[PDB]
Design a protein around this nucleic acid. Structure first.
Length: 50
DNA sequence: GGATGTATATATCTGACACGTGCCTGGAGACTAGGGAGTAATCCCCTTGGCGGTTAAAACGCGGGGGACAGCGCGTACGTG
């Protein structure tokens, strides 16, 4: 529900070292479509989507 | 032998203090009423965290030219006696 908790988990997976992608209200629709197509690709190395 | 600087004693000024006195204004005691504290209900406004979309305002870069500022002359108006 909070994007600051999304920032907390994003930094947790960043120092943890897990390929993560993110979507919230600050992200414009072009990068949203880019992240959705990147997560749904068959050769995606992304593991967790926020 | 005459004239001069310092030292203790007495009279006078001068603000402060002890005493006197009035009186009036503040304090002690009692009573009362009402102003304010507390409670409950109802409804509207504000808080914190989010989202979406428009779009006009804000930010940034760059040319250039208008204006701020420094320097110099002068003559007159103000300082000074």
């Amino acid at each position: 529900q909070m994007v600051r908790m999304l920032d907390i988990l994003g930094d947790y997976l960043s120092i943890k070292g897990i390929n993560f992608q993110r979507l919230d209200g600050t992200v414009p629709s072009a990068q949203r479509r880019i992240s959705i197509d990147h997560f749904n690709s068959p050769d995606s190395n992304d593991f967790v989507f926020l």
